[PDB]
Amino acid sequence: KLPPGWEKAMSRSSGRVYYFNHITNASQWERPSGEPARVRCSHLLVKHSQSRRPSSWRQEKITRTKEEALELINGYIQKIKSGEEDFESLASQFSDCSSAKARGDLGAFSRGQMQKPFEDASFALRTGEMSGPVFTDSGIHIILRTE
């Protein structure tokens, strides 16, 4: 009953049941449905003033608050989910990581290499699926599992 991390919840707005993943922060109306050694993922990182290194190729001094970074992240998720913009396009333009130059692709990795909240979300995604906001010391990410 429900894959790893998935649980059922009541929408306050609509009164309909939804499904949420406490490991990936994914949420959706639809019922979701041998852990691989490696996964491949892309990400979009929004840094803020409390990030470990508040600097990127986009902006030498990042000054936004963590609250403002999360609003940005939420906005990007809305644009991706609506199909107004695709993930790769937003990562290329707006990610505060040099991975932006490869459409956010980080390549393949196993457990024990990445920041643990990043890793955990990555391995709880099925191929094709996207996370909600994932919080690490680097900042807030959206993760897309591509393999």
Side-chain angles (χ1 to χ4, degrees), residues 76-116:
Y76 296 143
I77 291 168
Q78 290 183 323
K79 285 195 243 157
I80 296 161
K81 285 196 164 188
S82 78
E84 281 166 59
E85 284 296 337
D86 55 26
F87 179 99
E88 291 91 344
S89 169
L90 294 177
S92 290
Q93 288 176 268
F94 299 120
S95 182
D96 281 311
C97 177
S98 58
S99 62
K101 306 311 158 164
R103 302 175 162 208
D105 175 41
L106 297 170
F109 53 89
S110 73
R111 288 205 182 259
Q113 308 184 216
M114 307 308 282
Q115 286 169 332
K116 178 68 42 175

Coordinates of all heavy atoms in Angstrom, one line a residue, residues 76-116:
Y76 N 8.7 28.0 -9.5 CA 9.3 27.2 -10.6 C 8.5 25.8 -10.7 O 8.2 25.4 -11.8 CB 10.8 26.9 -10.3 CG 11.6 28.2 -10.4 CD1 12.7 28.4 -9.6 CD2 11.4 29.2 -11.4 CE1 13.5 29.5 -9.6 CE2 12.1 30.4 -11.4 CZ 13.2 30.5 -10.5 OH 14.0 31.7 -10.6
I77 N 8.2 25.2 -9.5 CA 7.4 24.0 -9.5 C 6.1 24.2 -10.2 O 5.6 23.4 -11.1 CB 7.3 23.4 -8.1 CG1 8.6 22.9 -7.6 CG2 6.2 22.3 -8.1 CD1 8.6 22.6 -6.1
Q78 N 5.4 25.3 -9.9 CA 4.1 25.7 -10.6 C 4.3 25.8 -12.1 O 3.5 25.1 -12.8 CB 3.5 27.0 -10.0 CG 3.0 26.8 -8.6 CD 2.4 28.1 -8.1 OE1 2.8 29.2 -8.5 NE2 1.2 27.9 -7.5
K79 N 5.3 26.4 -12.6 CA 5.6 26.6 -14.0 C 5.9 25.2 -14.7 O 5.4 25.0 -15.7 CB 6.8 27.6 -14.2 CG 6.4 29.1 -14.0 CD 7.4 30.0 -14.5 CE 8.0 30.9 -13.5 NZ 9.4 31.5 -14.0
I80 N 6.6 24.4 -14.0 CA 7.0 23.0 -14.6 C 5.7 22.2 -14.6 O 5.4 21.5 -15.6 CB 8.1 22.4 -13.7 CG1 9.4 23.2 -13.8 CG2 8.2 20.9 -14.1 CD1 10.4 22.8 -12.7
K81 N 5.0 22.1 -13.5 CA 3.8 21.3 -13.4 C 2.7 21.7 -14.4 O 1.9 20.9 -14.9 CB 3.2 21.3 -12.0 CG 4.0 20.4 -11.1 CD 3.2 20.1 -9.9 CE 3.8 19.0 -9.1 NZ 2.8 18.7 -8.0
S82 N 2.6 23.0 -14.7 CA 1.6 23.6 -15.6 C 2.0 23.3 -17.1 O 1.2 23.5 -18.0 CB 1.4 25.1 -15.4 OG 2.5 25.8 -15.9
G83 N 3.3 23.0 -17.3 CA 3.9 22.9 -18.6 C 4.1 24.2 -19.3 O 4.6 24.2 -20.5
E84 N 4.1 25.3 -18.5 CA 4.5 26.6 -19.1 C 6.0 26.7 -19.4 O 6.4 27.3 -20.3 CB 4.2 27.8 -18.1 CG 2.8 28.3 -18.0 CD 2.5 29.1 -16.8 OE1 3.2 30.2 -16.7 OE2 1.7 28.8 -16.0
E85 N 6.8 26.0 -18.6 CA 8.2 26.0 -18.8 C 8.7 24.6 -18.5 O 8.1 23.9 -17.6 CB 8.9 27.0 -17.8 CG 8.8 28.4 -18.3 CD 9.5 28.6 -19.6 OE1 10.4 27.8 -20.0 OE2 9.1 29.5 -20.4
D86 N 9.7 24.1 -19.2 CA 10.1 22.7 -18.7 C 11.3 22.9 -17.7 O 11.9 24.0 -17.6 CB 10.4 21.8 -19.9 CG 11.4 22.2 -20.9 OD1 12.2 23.0 -20.6 OD2 11.2 21.8 -22.1
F87 N 11.5 21.8 -17.0 CA 12.5 21.8 -16.0 C 13.9 22.2 -16.5 O 14.5 23.1 -15.9 CB 12.6 20.3 -15.4 CG 13.6 20.2 -14.3 CD1 13.2 20.2 -13.0 CD2 14.9 20.0 -14.7 CE1 14.2 20.0 -12.0 CE2 15.9 19.8 -13.7 CZ 15.5 19.9 -12.4
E88 N 14.3 21.7 -17.7 CA 15.7 22.0 -18.2 C 15.8 23.5 -18.5 O 16.9 24.0 -18.2 CB 15.9 21.2 -19.5 CG 16.0 19.7 -19.2 CD 14.6 19.0 -19.4 OE1 13.5 19.6 -19.3 OE2 14.7 17.7 -19.5
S89 N 14.8 24.1 -19.0 CA 14.8 25.5 -19.3 C 15.0 26.3 -18.1 O 15.8 27.3 -18.1 CB 13.5 25.8 -20.1 OG 13.4 27.2 -20.2
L90 N 14.3 26.0 -17.0 CA 14.4 26.8 -15.8 C 15.7 26.5 -15.1 O 16.2 27.5 -14.5 CB 13.2 26.5 -14.9 CG 11.8 26.9 -15.4 CD1 10.8 26.5 -14.3 CD2 11.8 28.4 -15.6
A91 N 16.2 25.3 -15.1 CA 17.5 25.0 -14.5 C 18.6 25.8 -15.2 O 19.4 26.4 -14.5 CB 17.7 23.5 -14.5
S92 N 18.5 25.8 -16.5 CA 19.6 26.4 -17.3 C 19.6 27.9 -17.0 O 20.7 28.5 -17.0 CB 19.3 26.3 -18.8 OG 19.5 25.0 -19.1
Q93 N 18.5 28.5 -16.8 CA 18.4 30.0 -16.7 C 18.6 30.4 -15.2 O 19.1 31.4 -15.0 CB 17.0 30.5 -17.1 CG 16.9 30.5 -18.6 CD 15.5 30.9 -19.1 OE1 14.6 30.1 -19.2 NE2 15.3 32.1 -19.3
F94 N 18.1 29.6 -14.2 CA 17.9 30.2 -12.9 C 18.6 29.4 -11.8 O 18.6 29.9 -10.6 CB 16.4 30.3 -12.6 CG 15.6 31.2 -13.6 CD1 14.6 30.7 -14.3 CD2 16.0 32.5 -13.7 CE1 14.0 31.5 -15.3 CE2 15.4 33.3 -14.7 CZ 14.4 32.8 -15.4
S95 N 19.1 28.3 -12.0 CA 19.7 27.5 -11.0 C 21.0 28.2 -10.5 O 21.9 28.6 -11.4 CB 20.1 26.1 -11.4 OG 20.6 25.3 -10.4
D96 N 21.2 28.3 -9.2 CA 22.4 28.9 -8.6 C 23.5 27.9 -8.4 O 24.1 27.8 -7.4 CB 22.0 29.5 -7.2 CG 21.3 30.8 -7.2 OD1 21.8 31.7 -7.9 OD2 20.3 30.9 -6.4
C97 N 23.7 27.0 -9.4 CA 24.8 26.0 -9.4 C 25.2 26.0 -10.9 O 24.5 26.1 -11.8 CB 24.3 24.7 -9.0 SG 25.4 23.3 -9.0
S98 N 26.5 25.6 -11.1 CA 27.1 25.5 -12.4 C 26.5 24.3 -13.2 O 26.7 24.3 -14.4 CB 28.6 25.5 -12.4 OG 29.0 24.5 -11.5
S99 N 25.9 23.4 -12.5 CA 25.1 22.3 -13.1 C 24.1 22.9 -14.1 O 23.6 22.2 -15.0 CB 24.4 21.4 -12.1 OG 23.5 22.2 -11.3
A100 N 23.7 24.2 -13.9 CA 22.8 24.9 -14.8 C 23.3 24.8 -16.3 O 22.5 24.7 -17.2 CB 22.7 26.3 -14.4
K101 N 24.6 24.7 -16.5 CA 25.1 24.7 -17.8 C 24.9 23.3 -18.5 O 25.0 23.2 -19.7 CB 26.6 25.0 -17.8 CG 27.0 26.3 -17.1 CD 26.2 27.5 -17.6 CE 26.2 28.6 -16.5 NZ 25.8 29.8 -17.0
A102 N 24.6 22.3 -17.8 CA 24.2 21.0 -18.3 C 22.7 20.7 -18.1 O 22.3 19.6 -17.8 CB 25.1 19.9 -17.7
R103 N 21.8 21.7 -18.1 CA 20.4 21.6 -17.9 C 20.1 21.0 -16.6 O 19.0 20.3 -16.4 CB 19.7 20.7 -19.0 CG 19.9 21.2 -20.4 CD 19.4 20.3 -21.5 NE 19.4 21.2 -22.7 CZ 18.5 21.1 -23.7 NH1 17.6 20.2 -23.7 NH2 18.6 22.0 -24.7
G104 N 21.0 21.2 -15.6 CA 20.8 20.8 -14.2 C 21.3 19.4 -14.0 O 21.2 18.9 -12.8
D105 N 21.8 18.7 -15.0 CA 22.2 17.3 -14.8 C 23.4 17.2 -13.9 O 24.4 17.9 -14.2 CB 22.4 16.6 -16.2 CG 22.9 15.2 -16.2 OD1 22.4 14.4 -15.3 OD2 23.7 14.8 -17.0
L106 N 23.4 16.3 -12.9 CA 24.5 16.0 -12.1 C 25.1 14.6 -12.4 O 26.1 14.3 -11.8 CB 24.0 15.9 -10.6 CG 23.5 17.2 -10.1 CD1 22.8 17.0 -8.7 CD2 24.5 18.3 -10.0
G107 N 24.5 13.9 -13.3 CA 24.9 12.5 -13.7 C 24.4 11.5 -12.7 O 23.5 11.8 -11.8
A108 N 25.1 10.3 -12.8 CA 24.7 9.1 -12.0 C 25.5 9.2 -10.6 O 26.6 9.7 -10.6 CB 25.1 7.9 -12.7
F109 N 24.8 8.7 -9.6 CA 25.5 8.6 -8.3 C 24.8 7.5 -7.4 O 23.8 7.0 -7.7 CB 25.5 9.9 -7.5 CG 24.1 10.6 -7.4 CD1 23.3 10.3 -6.3 CD2 23.6 11.4 -8.3 CE1 22.0 10.8 -6.2 CE2 22.4 12.0 -8.2 CZ 21.6 11.7 -7.2
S110 N 25.6 7.1 -6.4 CA 25.1 6.1 -5.5 C 24.8 6.7 -4.2 O 25.2 7.9 -4.0 CB 26.1 4.9 -5.4 OG 27.2 5.3 -4.6
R111 N 24.2 6.0 -3.3 CA 24.1 6.4 -1.8 C 25.6 6.6 -1.3 O 26.5 5.9 -1.8 CB 23.4 5.4 -1.0 CG 21.9 5.5 -1.3 CD 21.1 4.9 -0.1 NE 19.7 4.9 -0.4 CZ 18.8 5.8 0.0 NH1 19.2 6.9 0.6 NH2 17.5 5.5 0.0
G112 N 25.7 7.6 -0.4 CA 27.0 7.8 0.2 C 27.9 8.8 -0.5 O 29.0 9.0 -0.1
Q113 N 27.3 9.5 -1.5 CA 28.1 10.6 -2.3 C 27.6 12.0 -2.1 O 28.3 12.9 -2.1 CB 28.1 10.4 -3.8 CG 28.5 9.1 -4.3 CD 28.6 9.1 -5.8 OE1 28.2 8.1 -6.4 NE2 29.0 10.1 -6.5
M114 N 26.2 12.1 -2.1 CA 25.6 13.4 -2.1 C 25.2 13.7 -0.7 O 25.1 12.9 0.1 CB 24.3 13.4 -3.0 CG 24.6 12.9 -4.4 SD 25.9 13.7 -5.3 CE 25.2 15.2 -5.8
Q115 N 24.8 15.0 -0.5 CA 24.2 15.5 0.7 C 23.0 14.6 1.0 O 22.2 14.3 0.1 CB 23.8 17.0 0.4 CG 24.9 17.9 0.5 CD 24.4 19.3 -0.1 OE1 23.5 19.4 -0.9 NE2 25.1 20.3 0.4
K116 N 22.8 14.2 2.3 CA 21.9 13.1 2.6 C 20.4 13.4 2.2 O 19.7 12.6 1.8 CB 22.0 12.7 4.1 CG 21.1 11.6 4.6 CD 21.3 10.2 4.0 CE 22.8 9.8 3.9 NZ 22.9 8.3 3.5

